[PDB]
Amino acid sequence: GDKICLGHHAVSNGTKVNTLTERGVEVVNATETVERTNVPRICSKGKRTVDLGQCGLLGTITGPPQCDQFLEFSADLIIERREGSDVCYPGKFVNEEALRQILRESGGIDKETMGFTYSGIRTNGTTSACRRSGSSFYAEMKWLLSNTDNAAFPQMTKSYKNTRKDPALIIWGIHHSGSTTEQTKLYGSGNKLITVGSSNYQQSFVPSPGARPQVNGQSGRIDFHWLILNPNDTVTFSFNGAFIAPDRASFLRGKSMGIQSEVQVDANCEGDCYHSGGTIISNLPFQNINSRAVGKCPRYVKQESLLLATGMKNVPE
Amino acid sequence: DKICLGHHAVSNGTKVNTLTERGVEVVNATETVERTNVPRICSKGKRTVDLGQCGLLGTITGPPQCDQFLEFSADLIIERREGSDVCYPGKFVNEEALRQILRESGGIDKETMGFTYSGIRTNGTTSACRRSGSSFYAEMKWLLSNTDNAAFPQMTKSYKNTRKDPALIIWGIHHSGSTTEQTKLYGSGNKLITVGSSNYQQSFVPSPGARPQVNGQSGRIDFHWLILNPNDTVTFSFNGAFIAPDRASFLRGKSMGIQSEVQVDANCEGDCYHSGGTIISNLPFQNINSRAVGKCPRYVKQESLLLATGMKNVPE
Amino acid sequence: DKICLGHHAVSNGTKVNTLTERGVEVVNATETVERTNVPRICSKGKRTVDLGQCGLLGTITGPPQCDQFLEFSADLIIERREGSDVCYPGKFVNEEALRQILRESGGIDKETMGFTYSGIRTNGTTSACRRSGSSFYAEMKWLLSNTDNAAFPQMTKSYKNTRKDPALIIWGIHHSGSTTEQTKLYGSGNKLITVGSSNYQQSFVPSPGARPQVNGQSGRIDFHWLILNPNDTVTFSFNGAFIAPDRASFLRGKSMGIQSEVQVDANCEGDCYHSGGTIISNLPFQNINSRAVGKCPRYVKQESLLLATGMKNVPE
Amino acid sequence: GLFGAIAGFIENGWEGLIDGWYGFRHQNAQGEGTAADYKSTQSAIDQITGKLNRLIEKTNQQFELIDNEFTEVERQIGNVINWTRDSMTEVWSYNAELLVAMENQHTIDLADSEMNKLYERVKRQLRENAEEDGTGCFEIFHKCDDDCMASIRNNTYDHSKYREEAIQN
Amino acid sequence: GLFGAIAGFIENGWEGLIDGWYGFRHQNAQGEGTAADYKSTQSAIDQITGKLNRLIEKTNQQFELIDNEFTEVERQIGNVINWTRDSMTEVWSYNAELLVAMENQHTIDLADSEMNKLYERVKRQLRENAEEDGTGCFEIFHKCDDDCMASIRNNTYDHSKYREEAIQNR
Amino acid sequence: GLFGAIAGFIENGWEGLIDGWYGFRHQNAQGEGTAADYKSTQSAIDQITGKLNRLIEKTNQQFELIDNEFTEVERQIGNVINWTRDSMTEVWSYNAELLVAMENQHTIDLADSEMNKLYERVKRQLRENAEEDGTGCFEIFHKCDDDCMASIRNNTYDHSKYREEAIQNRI
């Protein structure tokens, strides 16, 4: 005779997933859990953005021609480019990456004169590696000479107190001339000493003239150095030549986030997870796009794919 | 007439999270993340040394603050914000490496280097290290020249490590405020200071010039150290500007080092410490301080994570 | 008369842990943590090079121990406790960085720098570097002055990297036991040694003085190294005390480096290695050695963690 | 698997049923028919979306660069950074694959469970006026018309109103 | 959820029952009454405490400082240390939230399961002398006095001793 | 625990049964006997091996040395390396102990579950021609010979072919 029967649904085409117990079981419906789709632009909508282009982050502090428009920038988001260069006259920074990490999160910088003042020397030393229109130099810095070639360089001391509420970024340079005879034409003769102290920091420098391969037509080099001067603390500079003096000190504006990217800015899309090939916009817990992404990101995983069941076992005829 | 089974309930349950639902009410729950700190350093049963004003590294060179700590012994070492390593201004190279070694040494045991001197002064002192009037680093010797501007005559001194364990050897470079001061002190010309073992080669020149003054001093001492292996020898070739070690140090055993801002208390015990006290707890997790050290529950972000200890709560 | 269903059991079960209970007995279980080590380096199928007495870094400078390894090729590199980088005493700067590069280089391919010399001696040797009688680092040149106390005439030498990959450039600073020895060797006055590329600026002064003697030597060599990019040039300005590179090095491909105390064995295969041998295993976890490298089960603290592979065991 | 119904004593599912997850098929005098049960269907769905909300969320945890794609940091620190980053990749891939397998076992089992619960409640509505077929069917030992059928479906069905009659057969 | 009883075919729980986790309420000639089942109650409790002991334990793993609150270490190594520490905070917060959610699902389900098991055993004691009400009740098709009621409760109840009688009334 | 059968309403297991995981013991006219059920047994086994394959696999993730057993690296970096390595040891030991406990709870429960499912199917084959004993037994309210017994076992047993007869004896 007559009866009642209960059952459940199914579909002709299910999706298969993994369980604890079996690999490739078919369920009515599933959903992805690992993000594969990148947006090939830096989604920057709503955020104060500064794209350094040709200026190197560290050049932001010393001031080569590329960086003139960035000596006092302000940003929530900072973008470094492959093309960017920290330098016009050839040289390096010591602890350069520490510095970059500080500057990336500073929210930008605010300059202020050291108020150094000079007598018994030249101040205007320039070079054709640093061209504005004709020979020029690091905008934040002063190429300290002796009155004309090969005059003596008269022992100097200069000091700067940090009278502000926050710590200062103090910078300076050591010049290594192509020759010993060049060191001479510039800063006179004999070997040269350059010391630097605070309440916090003791260190010391001698120049090292000699041939390097030429870079923007130069066999010489500048070594750049820096330290963080605490509020109320004083830095002093004892020196006798070969020295590249800071004209201005720097202060950090607030807070930001630094990225390195190869793609275009786009104020039409928003996101907080960035990598050099773009922005990962997604709600998902995981991603397989780029393990070096920075920001607020889904966790990077190895798998291309991990399906989460969102329905029952699929049982057809 | 009939029989019916059922289960309990209560008017006021506690709600928790499950895999499947947020805020479901269960008969009873218990906490899993520790929020309660004890604002003291619970040190009961443990050989404790509170450095107070002495800096850990000062323990090795010997400024006035550290006179009572030149040979300490501990299971537990406490560093204080007020503590200072130094009397005459200066720094240690690889200073944090050193602190990490000393924090777990169970303390130190000193022993003379047996250095002996002729053709110079040994007694150079300063008003930055006052005992009663001018003195100096207790473990160290301020090496001069016979009086003002005399020459400094090239010296070599060597020390063999004749003990079963490695030695902590220390020494100092002096950078005078002037070049002319470097002169009144150790004579004239530039100065070299080398240092070798079977293990370690390095070399030092002084750097006179103005620094801002600190305890009324424009000069500085650079401190250096190395670990001398058993049977190995260190030797010191130098020609001035040198601050010689009077004694070598050996590590006593094992300990644990903390940095704290609170009082010792021998009435409570624990093994999880941080600068604001001790975390006494059985729980798997804590949200008090992510920098806690010792034997500690794992630090997590959440203030709270309730574990169900009863069934689902179903009232009328 | 009736039908009854049931399930199996055994007299001797294995007990395991659950979420809910510790020590419950199941019909059968299996281990999950590997405890068994093979006390050999299982190297079957792999191009292997066991350096024995040669130190990996010696592979680059060329002391007598390393003569057979100046141009090796490997999938797998083995470093030995007995191995030494050096014949005349000294060190490499950033020595571990260098080892890490060399361990994964798949070996090295040498090529002349083509340096050529006039106005000096080239043949300076020593009894710490014996072939038959006094010699020297095979890849290097001990640069002198024409005889005892002669002057050392300022030199520049440059090398362009004309190849498709980066070059490993190396060189040495000599610190003589005396200042007077520095003299007999490279003449007089203080000495400067600079080194630049498009990529790298740095500078060196020698530091003569007494060190304890090591293979009968009070002197030392400081070795330095840099990576020269394709089409970049390195140049060497120097005025004495300099140990010049005869040949540059290039990396062959890819490999894996280990440090071991046991014998090679081409009869067994594995990819998980440590100093006491090879861990051959399918299991997810191991408790043999937390420093194992290769492709390894995850190291855990527990000796043992049994996985149930059968039902609850219920006997009478 | 676990509750023994879906892919268990029920043979297979119903492509026919496009209206919910669980349903009834009836067979009486006036023909055949089917319909979806909302209460059970909703309970499955509500639970699954519970899971989903718990996994699709928001780290508020910022990280920054410690590393440099354009000018490589120094090798030693470079290799410590890469080794650390690779260890965390090992941890998160393990967590991810495990989470998804775990959740999938549970999802499947709670769906099986929800079907079994629906069965149970009906067996119980029909105390004595029916027998379990064994393939998920209830053989009704009286005549029950479309209207009566819907009384089971919508849970307002008096059993003792066919009791005398059904017990008889 | 899972076993379909608690917050299932049972309507609700009993604030009345302060004596155990699971119980019986009976209705006969001589009035109403209730009482707690010890065996089932103990089994739930013992299992939950099993969980608790597993989670409230002892790391014997010491860690030390790599870092310095009073004199900051150098920035590069500083930032590598912070990045590492923050990655581990991410791992442990994830583990913690997951563990607690997982255990909670299971706790709730094993409690539901224990109630269902108690039901089952009684249905079975009463083979044929009763019907399932459907709301967690057993309608007894004979008279059963307080003393008989307790015979079900304490699991010594002969069914074929009311069989003739009860089968009759059904 | 969970499904209430193994270490539940079944008293204990059968050392006798060496032929499968789950079985039938019968008692009729012609004596006693036993035999293993392949379908249920296979389902338990297949599921457990499922687990095993998932856990005994292959990291393809290489790691190298960052550290040095023969010439110690510098202390600061040394201690950062050790701290990192110890943190990971904490993570993997926790994962390992958790995974094993979790899987063990589930293994045990799915074995219990499989027994319960076997019970169910038989109760249902025998609609009305038997009663649940309560200890895992089915009291058959007719005579059923070895051949009939095997008809239950091998799932081809017509219930309405003893229905008239059996319904009678339940009175």
Ligand SMILES: *[C@@H]1O[C@H](CO)[C@@H](O)[C@H](O)[C@H]1NC(C)=O
């Ligand atoms: C499949 O999964 C997603 C996520 O649950 C859902 O939005 C969608 O409705 C599902 N597809 C179907 C056909 O139900």
Ligand SMILES: *[C@@H]1O[C@H](CO)[C@@H](O)[C@H](O)[C@H]1NC(C)=O
């Ligand atoms: C630079 O300054 C000096 C005085 O300091 C001045 O005499 C000279 O003309 C200036 N040089 C150049 C190139 O402008």
Ligand SMILES: *[C@@H]1O[C@H](CO)[C@@H](O)[C@H](O)[C@H]1NC(C)=O
């Ligand atoms: C620095 O010193 C001045 C004394 O003029 C004092 O007023 C101020 O509080 C100090 N600033 C800080 C930041 O400590």
Ligand SMILES: *[C@@H]1O[C@H](CO)[C@@H](O)[C@H](O)[C@H]1NC(C)=O
């Ligand atoms: C609630 O939780 C704690 C931990 O299990 C327990 O000791 C206490 O008994 C519980 N409270 C009640 C009222 O049962």
Ligand SMILES: *[C@@H]1O[C@H](CO)[C@@H](O)[C@H](O)[C@H]1NC(C)=O
């Ligand atoms: C220090 O020692 C010298 C001799 O080495 C001695 O003549 C002198 O008086 C001492 N100086 C002081 C201030 O005690």
Ligand SMILES: *[C@@H]1O[C@H](CO)[C@@H](O)[C@H](O)[C@H]1NC(C)=O
């Ligand atoms: C050190 O040298 C002495 C020789 O007097 C010897 O007795 C001792 O065993 C040596 N030990 C080591 C570790 O070098």
Ligand SMILES: *[C@@H]1O[C@H](CO)[C@@H](O)[C@H](O)[C@H]1NC(C)=O
């Ligand atoms: C016990 O466990 C292992 C893993 O499943 C298996 O290979 C072996 O067959 C089992 N032993 C017995 C006696 O069943």
Ligand SMILES: *[C@@H]1O[C@H](CO)[C@@H](O)[C@H](O)[C@H]1NC(C)=O
């Ligand atoms: C090395 O070279 C010089 C000249 O270049 C030669 O006269 C001399 O014999 C050689 N010296 C030795 C020690 O063989």
Ligand SMILES: *[C@@H]1O[C@H](CO)[C@@H](O)[C@H](O)[C@H]1NC(C)=O
């Ligand atoms: C190096 O320069 C040469 C010019 O001779 C050129 O052919 C080659 O492409 C260059 N390499 C790179 C990487 O540009």
Ligand SMILES: *[C@@H]1O[C@H](CO)[C@@H](O)[C@H](O)[C@H]1NC(C)=O
């Ligand atoms: C670290 O890994 C990146 C890939 O993420 C690689 O390109 C780089 O060379 C590695 N660093 C070192 C120091 O070998």
Ligand SMILES: *[C@@H]1O[C@H](CO)[C@@H](O)[C@H](O)[C@H]1NC(C)=O
């Ligand atoms: C690292 O972390 C602490 C907070 O834990 C912070 O205060 C400190 O400045 C951080 N270090 C650096 C170098 O940013």
Ligand SMILES: *[C@@H]1O[C@H](CO)[C@@H](O)[C@H](O)[C@H]1NC(C)=O
């Ligand atoms: C790091 O760990 C090893 C053991 O894994 C230990 O022997 C070594 O000394 C430790 N390193 C430091 C720098 O203390």
